[PDB]
Design a protein around this ligand. Sequence first.
Ligand SMILES: O=C(NS(=O)(=O)c1ccc(NCC2CCOCC2)c([N+](=O)[O-])c1)c1ccc(N2CCC3(CC2)CC(N2CCC[C@H]2c2ccccc2C2CC2)C3)cc1Oc1cnc2[nH]ccc2c1
Length: 150
Amino acid sequence: YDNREIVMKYIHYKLSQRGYEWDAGDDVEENESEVVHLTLRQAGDDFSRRYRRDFAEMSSQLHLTPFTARGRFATVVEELFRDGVNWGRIVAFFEFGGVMCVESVNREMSPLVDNIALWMTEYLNRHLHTWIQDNGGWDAFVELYGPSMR
Ligand SMILES: O=C(NS(=O)(=O)c1ccc(NCC2CCOCC2)c([N+](=O)[O-])c1)c1ccc(N2CCC3(CC2)CC(N2CCC[C@H]2c2ccccc2C2CC2)C3)cc1Oc1cnc2[nH]ccc2c1
């Protein structure tokens, strides 16, 4: 699976469900990966429900600006992974990136979406890929958290 594609499709779906058409994502949508994208969306929606009130507070705490957005992303993701990697923290990472993109559009800072997608792709490639592959890959994520009987 292509980790950039996972990031792009996740962000694009999250934005499109708010009525924002992200052109980079529009061209991504035009090109069993679908089960991975779907399962990640479902897991992220479940995470955001479990943490709904904390997410509302975070949206108030992001303090997004063009010149500090990268540092906000860096601070949050470093703290999220301080105790190591697992599937739930990977889902949290995706949902956080999605919140950052939604907030960027809502605050008239839409260019940041492209930057956030890059930061997420690079973070996944540099920090999360070894763990993912050592733990059965995205196929193992789907087996654990997809539609199969638990
Ligand atoms: O359980 C965890 N990890 S797991 O591997 O066992 C597992 C369990 C279940 C699932 N799936 C079940 C779905 C499948 C679909 O069908 C329906 C059932 C999955 N997964 O799908 O991968 C994996 C787990 C790890 C860490 C964590 N943490 C929450 C608090 C923080 C640490 C991590 C602290 C908080 N930060 C503090 C400051 C900033 C804030 C922050 C940072 C980043 C993002 C958000 C936030 C704020 C909270 C909002 C994040 C919470 C966890 O709990 C959940 C509970 N349910 C979840 N559901 C989907 C993910 C999920 C995670």
